[PDB]
Amino acid sequence: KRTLLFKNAELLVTMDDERREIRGGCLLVEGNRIVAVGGDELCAAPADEEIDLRGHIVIPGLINTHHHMFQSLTRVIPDAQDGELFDWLNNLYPIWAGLTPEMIRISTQTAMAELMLSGCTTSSDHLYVYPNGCRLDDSIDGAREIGMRFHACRGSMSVGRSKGGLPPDELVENEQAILEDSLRLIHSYHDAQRYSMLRIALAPCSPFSVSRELMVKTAQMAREQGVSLHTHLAENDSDVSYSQTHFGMTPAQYAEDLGWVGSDVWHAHCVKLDRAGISLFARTGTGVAHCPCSNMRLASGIAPIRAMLDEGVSVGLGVDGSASNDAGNMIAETRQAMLLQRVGFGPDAMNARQALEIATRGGAKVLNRDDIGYLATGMAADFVAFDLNTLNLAGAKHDPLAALVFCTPGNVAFSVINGQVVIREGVLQTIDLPSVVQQHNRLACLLVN
Amino acid sequence: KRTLLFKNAELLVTMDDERREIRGGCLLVEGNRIVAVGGDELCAAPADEEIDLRGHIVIPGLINTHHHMFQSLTRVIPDAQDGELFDWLNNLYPIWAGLTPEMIRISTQTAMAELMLSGCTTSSDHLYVYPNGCRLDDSIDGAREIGMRFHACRGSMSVGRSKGGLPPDELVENEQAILEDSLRLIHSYHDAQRYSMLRIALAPCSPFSVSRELMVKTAQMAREQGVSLHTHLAENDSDVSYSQTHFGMTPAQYAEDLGWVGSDVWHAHCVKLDRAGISLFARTGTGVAHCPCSNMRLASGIAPIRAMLDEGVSVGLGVDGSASNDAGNMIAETRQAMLLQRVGFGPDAMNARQALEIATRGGAKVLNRDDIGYLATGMAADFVAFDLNTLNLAGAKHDPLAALVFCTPGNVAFSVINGQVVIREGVLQTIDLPSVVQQHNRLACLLVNRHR
Ligand SMILES: O=c1[nH]cc(F)c(=O)[nH]1
Ligand SMILES: O=c1[nH]cc(F)c(=O)[nH]1
Ligand SMILES: [Zn+2]
Ligand SMILES: [Zn+2]
């Protein structure tokens, strides 16, 4: 088995059970997993490759828990930059009706590359449109080429124009076809073993874009197959009113009534989750993907993340799709979580270590994994290093960890995912990034024009 | 005088009176000024150097209107990261008491380098501590090394611990000495001419950090000398209560009472400015430096920027000191202004072009300058270029301008300040940046290990 030693980090942030932050720390890797973490004599360990991390901070790889990677082809569309969410959807859906399998494959790589260079080693996605023969398989193909640990969601919608919804009919599917494809994807791709690089989750776009029968049947299938459940919930005032008018229930009551609570469930946004919903989520272990930049850029609101954390809700972090952020920058999203909670709820609402915990342990938690999210013996070899001697962090070496959240760092210097060194001295190793960016921009131009 | 042609930008954002955004745009420069702005007809122009900007967006240089660059030596101090503003001040003041002239000279270069690589071509600063023989001269020396267009404020404090204030006495000054040094700095350094690289403003830290007499005499001096006035105003709930309690007045009423209104005045933050204060500022031309990251990082609040703009208030942008942001990233601050107004006031509150106008034309206005802030014949040759073919902007070429605000771009590819190409292919040309960063971090270490 291949061994790898990362030695003499200026600070090794473990996020482990003691929250050890080790000066001069070293990390010994064998295959895809961590052998030991420490300073002192472990730094003298022989290894097939040694990488010198003096002057760097090492953190556990960031974990992104919500995205729509296909939207990285359609950032800052003029008719979608401003205005109401109604106009945003109505101007973007006809564009997305042109998506091809190749664009799914390429856009997954582009969005994952942006996340990887900004500190992220595991990401979910929420692909929920399948025009022109597009399949989740195309996104899985792209993810496999770039080497990121991947939770692929079988997103779905069934309520289109003919049934009184907003999406064009060409962007919705029959519900029997959705369940059959969901089952196929689990059988073909879901790896439930420790250190899995690919897991499947089932994800109707929202409880309102599919039938209530399909929400219950999806939950049933996920529980039978041992996979997770993901959807958008309580993202804005319109979601809350819709739930009340149409079902006589708050969004959280609606989720509970469908069986969409539990540690195998995580809901994106939850900006308008109420006190009873927070408590329900806390006692059922239901997770939340917090997407601060999206919630600001779409004027959704400030999610009550501090209140959720204070009751024991499992909270992870997500960038959301690139047409509603529009960046894909994980460490910048972690910064935004801290800034937004403080402006919303005061100076004690979120510090650097609490935000970074959401970005690491919190994300592992809401994806229902205990093998990622911190650095210790037997954990997955997922971690990143930032150079502390850059201009961006000059004067911030008083606390290298806080520097990543309070300052604006550049790209990571190194990234390791499943023991593979995927970024070396700021250069992505698993793909030809300039070629992918070129193809992406040509495809984006073809799609929109 | 040297001539420069910048040709074939994918998009040249002028911010001019017609807000032209020119595909294939070109810029012809002579010395410190723009000779022409146009399309490919400019390619027939002769120039000493041509720079090919295809694949790039060019924008007017961003203008930063509030800072404390000395704080770039003390980012994320553990005891100041969290807690109340009281704890922030009382844990940072003893550290700043060890500042030396060399630290002022170096920290100015570090803070300006961060601003320049993130799109900024003009900055003010608000140095308000002068321990151990430090002088505004030291900051001016650093700014002259790096080539940034500079509005240096003689900040001041006189109400210390022994007199019932929070700063220690070693960090406050006698008020007559403050006025004397203010006049010396104006006479020695303030260049009032077009395309000036150095202007002086007078800047008591807040209306409560000095006597009422110093507030009034400082304004009197500034008006006599023709320079501007700068201070912190209405940053938080404590500022509003204090002025109401001690003076029976809102912060903006108190500023008016002190004579601290007018187009030669700009107030930092104004988070808690009320409707009548907004109206007052609009009709007097009083400016505002909006500091969104600082206002969130210190839990100050969401300033009513959309309301001020709708009433006619001149609003610029500021990163604030690096101990309350803690970044110095001008284009990221522009993004934050847009994100924060939307979450505060709805989807119509601020778009990419509105935010970029605050960061350019808005900053020129609050600094009382008509020669920077947009690209047109006779304007200062201050502009920057971002590469549009980066991973960060992939899929955003549908609107190159909005991409700068809605995405998170890297450093600029090129920067021109006063006609000098100060950043070339991402590399800062005017200082040895890794050497300055090394010295900065070493001085930061010496500073925090001082005996106190
Ligand atoms: O912000 C968003 N809301 C709803 C959606 F379906 C989506 O893709 N993005
Ligand atoms: O936010 C701030 N408040 C007060 C200060 F003196 C300062 O520098 N910054
Ligand atoms: Zn989403
Ligand atoms: Zn300030």
Tab-separated table of C-alpha atoms and ligand atoms in Angstrom, chain A residues 68 70-71 85 88-89 93 96 128 205 232 235 269 294 298 320-321 324, ligand 1:
chain	number	residue	atom	x	y	z
A	68	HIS	CA	-26.815	22.450	-8.956
A	70	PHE	CA	-25.338	22.254	-14.322
A	71	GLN	CA	-26.036	25.919	-13.505
A	85	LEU	CA	-37.673	34.393	-8.170
A	88	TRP	CA	-35.483	33.879	-12.377
A	89	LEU	CA	-37.142	30.489	-12.899
A	93	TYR	CA	-35.878	27.042	-17.489
A	96	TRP	CA	-31.745	24.636	-19.295
A	128	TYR	CA	-33.053	17.832	-11.222
A	205	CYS	CA	-36.626	19.180	-6.232
A	232	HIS	CA	-35.424	22.207	-0.783
A	235	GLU	CA	-36.402	28.637	1.487
A	269	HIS	CA	-31.964	26.295	3.017
A	294	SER	CA	-27.640	31.974	-2.255
A	298	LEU	CA	-31.904	35.637	-4.071
A	320	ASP	CA	-26.099	25.962	-4.036
A	321	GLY	CA	-26.289	26.145	-7.830
A	324	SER	CA	-27.977	31.521	-7.483
C	1	LIG	O1	-32.364	28.974	-5.445
C	1	LIG	C1	-33.025	28.113	-5.992
C	1	LIG	N1	-34.331	27.835	-5.681
C	1	LIG	C2	-35.053	26.857	-6.297
C	1	LIG	C3	-34.497	26.088	-7.245
C	1	LIG	F1	-35.224	25.127	-7.828
C	1	LIG	C4	-33.100	26.266	-7.654
C	1	LIG	O2	-32.481	25.634	-8.497
C	1	LIG	N2	-32.480	27.293	-6.963
